[PDB]
Amino acid sequence: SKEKFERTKPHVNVGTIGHVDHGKTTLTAAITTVLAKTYGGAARAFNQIDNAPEEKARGITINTSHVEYDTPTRHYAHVDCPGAADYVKNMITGAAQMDGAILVVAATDGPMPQTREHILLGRQVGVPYIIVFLNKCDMVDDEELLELVEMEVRELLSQYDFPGDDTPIVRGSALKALEGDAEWEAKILELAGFLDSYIPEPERAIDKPFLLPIEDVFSISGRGTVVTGRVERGIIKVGEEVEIVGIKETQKSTCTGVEMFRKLLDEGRAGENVGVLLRGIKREEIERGQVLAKPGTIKPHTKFESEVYILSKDEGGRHTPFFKGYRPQFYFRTTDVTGTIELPEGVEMVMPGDNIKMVVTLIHPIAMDDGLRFAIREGGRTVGAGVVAKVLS
RNA sequence: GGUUUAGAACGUCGUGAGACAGUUCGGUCCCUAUCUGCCGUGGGCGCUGGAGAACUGAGGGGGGCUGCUCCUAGUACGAGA
Ligand SMILES: Nc1nc2c(ncn2[C@@H]2O[C@H](COP(=O)(O)OP(=O)(O)OP(=O)(O)O)[C@@H](O)[C@H]2O)c(=O)[nH]1
Ligand SMILES: [Mg+2]
Ligand SMILES: [Mg+2]
Ligand SMILES: [Mg+2]
Ligand SMILES: [Mg+2]
Ligand SMILES: [Mg+2]
Ligand SMILES: [Mg+2]
Ligand SMILES: [Mg+2]
Ligand SMILES: [Mg+2]
Ligand SMILES: [Mg+2]
Ligand SMILES: [Mg+2]
Ligand SMILES: [Mg+2]
Ligand SMILES: [Mg+2]
Ligand SMILES: [Mg+2]
Ligand SMILES: [Mg+2]
Ligand SMILES: [Mg+2]
Ligand SMILES: [Mg+2]
Ligand SMILES: [Mg+2]
Ligand SMILES: [Mg+2]
Ligand SMILES: [Mg+2]
Ligand SMILES: [Mg+2]
Ligand SMILES: [Mg+2]
Ligand SMILES: [Mg+2]
Ligand SMILES: [Mg+2]
């Protein structure tokens, strides 16, 4: 919090997706040291991407860490996802703000169950674009074996409804690029080119009023409570009235500084991850799931009608009927919440793979409007996508 | 230290002397090694003329224990941990 962030080069939210222990987090560490050395940005290291006791004694990542690497054309902002089966909830917050992912499948193991589960969550939430990266390569010195894995990833993406064959598959070791190998340094410089070429300039909404979902709350020693997250729409000026709506109730507030990776800002525009500092709020009372809206724009609701599209076995979901009293998890912008289902009259049962409308009473109120997209999940897997129809409360 | 002598007391049994795998406090542990054995250390003669060395090695005898940490490799094995 000292240097002013100059608004030059378009902002893009990138992040690594893939299987457990697959060079997902190590790729992010390779991207920093490669781009910092040649172009001449800020250095950083692989340690700062994941410290704590939880990501050292174990080794695995839980928290969605963030990184800022700059290139001549654009200014990227990384989101390193966790990857494991237990950490799907805090991943979806990292994956929702991500515009164009970098998928991570490896040349020794290949596509494994989580890779299918990750890309499934990317479609229903919001992941337009995706780039493959083979994160081992050197361990198996062979031309025939390494290229057989490329075929199966093209099959996976195309089977699940992505381009597949059009996606630029890249090969390169992360640990070799970390030290200083001229061939492998240049091969991950090539990935920075593939991010620039394939992913276009993202479409933001800097017109309709301010909204910002809170991904992770902080308490800065000196300033007060800081909320992070991508600004979904509108803008944020310093010393402007902001209403925090969602779980519990609703509180008034005012912004006292917006920032971009420990650098000051005047206007926090849409489509970019920013840390908003709120005035006169405690760490405990403000929680994860609430949204920073402009006063009057949005209202918290505990009941709503919604056109729910339930999935079948082929698309990946439930395979049995259910009656009123069923309680699955509804993932709106960031957080999840449980809610009882009340079906319409003249509908005895809800079969899998069917379009119907239904009233859903949530246990916690969340800020919502008509035409909001969500993805229902239960039992460590997906259930059904849909849209909000009418407000009731 | 315990149990097992003489003192004393408690509970208990006995009219009592006393008694109790009931308890409680106090209460002499000798031996200079002949033989066998064993550990060492010599004298004597023998080994075929004597003497000084150096050995071979039949046959004994000691010795023989394991831990972590790193590397292999977060590799194989596992959705994962
Ligand atoms: N040979 C090789 N090993 C790698 C590479 N990248 C990572 N590793 C190994 O895997 C670990 C790196 O963590 P990754 O699993 O790649 O990334 P991650 O985000 O921690 O993975 P998740 O647990 O899924 O979050 C290190 O301990 C490395 O030993 C690579 O490019 N080549
Ligand atoms: Mg990860
Ligand atoms: Mg006060
Ligand atoms: Mg005694
Ligand atoms: Mg005694
Ligand atoms: Mg007596
Ligand atoms: Mg007796
Ligand atoms: Mg007795
Ligand atoms: Mg005693
Ligand atoms: Mg005495
Ligand atoms: Mg004595
Ligand atoms: Mg004698
Ligand atoms: Mg003797
Ligand atoms: Mg002897
Ligand atoms: Mg003789
Ligand atoms: Mg002789
Ligand atoms: Mg002879
Ligand atoms: Mg011998
Ligand atoms: Mg003999
Ligand atoms: Mg022996
Ligand atoms: Mg040993
Ligand atoms: Mg190691
Ligand atoms: Mg190891
Ligand atoms: Mg591991």
Q: Identity (one letter) of the amino acid at A356?
A: I
Q: Identity (one letter) of the amino acid at A65?
A: S
Nucleotide nearest to A108 (CA to C1'): B75
| Residue A336 · residue A379 · CB < 8 Å | no
Distance CA A232, CA A392 (A): 24
For residue A65 and ligand 1, the question of a CB distance below 6 A is answered with no
Q: Tokens 């630029």 appear where?
A: A168
DSSP for residue A49: T
Which residues partner with A15 through β-bridges? A101
CA atoms lying within 13 Å on the CB side of residue A265: 21
CA A170 to centroid of ligand 4, rounded, Å: 90
| Residue A358 · residue A341 · CB < 8 Å | yes
For residue A25 and ligand 1, the question of a CB distance below 6 A is answered with yes
| Residue A374 · residue A331 · CB < 8 Å | yes
Nucleotide nearest to A139 (CA to C1'): B75
Technique employed here was: cryo-EM
Distance CA A300, CA A339 (A): 15
Going by their DSSP bridges, the two strands A129-134 and A170-171 should be labelled as parallel
Task: Write down the number of H helices and E strands in chain A.
Answer: 6, 22
Distance CA A127, CA A107 (A): 24
| Residue A122 · residue A157 · CB < 8 Å | no
Tokens of A45: 């290291």
Ligand 2 (ion): residues with CB under 5 Å are A 24-25, 61, 83
Q: Resolution in A for the shown PDB structure?
A: 3.0
Q: Tokens 């803008």 appear where?
A: A235
Task: State the alpha helices, DSSP H only, in A40-71.
Answer: none
For residue A187 and ligand 1, the question of a CB distance below 6 A is answered with no
Strands (E), A260-299: 264-265, 267-268, 273-278, 291-293
Q: What is residue A6's three-state secondary structure? A: coil
Q: Tokens 């000026």 appear where?
A: A237
| Residue A330 · residue A376 · CB < 8 Å | yes
Tokens of A374: 């969500």
Ligand 1 binding pocket mutation candidate from A17, A19, A21 (most atoms within 8 A of CB):
A21
CA A65 to centroid of ligand 15, rounded, Å: 99
A309 phi, psi to nearest 5 deg: -95, 105
Which protein residues have any CB–strand B distance under 7 A?
Answer: A 19-21, 58-60, 84-86, 108-109, 112-114
Which residues partner with A291 through β-bridges? A213, A245
Residue A19, C-beta contacts closer than 8 angstroms, at least 6 positions apart: A83, A104, A105, A106, A109, A111, A112, A113, A114, A115, A118
Nearest CA, atom 15, ligand 1 = A21
Q: What is residue A96's three-state secondary structure? A: helix
Atom from ligand 1 closest to the CA of residue A139: 1
Residue A163, C-beta contacts closer than 8 angstroms, at least 6 positions apart: A157
Q: What is the CA radius of gyration of chain A?
A: 22
After which residues, if any, is chain A broken (C to N > 2.5 Å)? none
End-to-end CA distance of chain A: 42
Nucleotide nearest to A20 (CA to C1'): B80
DSSP string, A65-83: EEE--B-SS-EEEEEE---
Q: What angle do CA A68, A72, A77 make, to 5 degrees?
A: 20
Task: Provide the 10 A C-beta neighbour count for residue A30.
Answer: 24
| Residue A322 · residue A350 · CB < 8 Å | yes
Distance CA A23, CA A175 (A): 9
CA atoms lying within 13 Å on the CB side of residue A190: 15
Strands (E), A48-176: 65-67, 75-80, 100-105, 129-134, 170-171
Residue A363, C-beta contacts closer than 8 angstroms, at least 6 positions apart: A337, A338, A339
**Interatomic separation, CA of residue A16 and C1' of nucleotide B14, rounded (Å):** 99
For residue A82 and ligand 1, the question of a CB distance below 6 A is answered with yes
Nucleotide nearest to A83 (CA to C1'): B80
| Residue A16 · residue A119 · CB < 8 Å | no
Nearest CA, atom 8, ligand 1 = A23
**Interatomic separation, CA of residue A123 and C1' of nucleotide B59, rounded (Å):** 88
- Among residues A48, A32, A79, A42, the alpha carbon closest in space to that of A191 is found at A32
DSSP for residue A3: S
Q: What is residue A304's three-state secondary structure? A: strand
| Burial tier of A2 (Cβ tally within 10 Å: 0-12, 13-18, 19+) | exposed
- Among residues A51, A326, A371, A34, the alpha carbon closest in space to that of A180 is found at A34
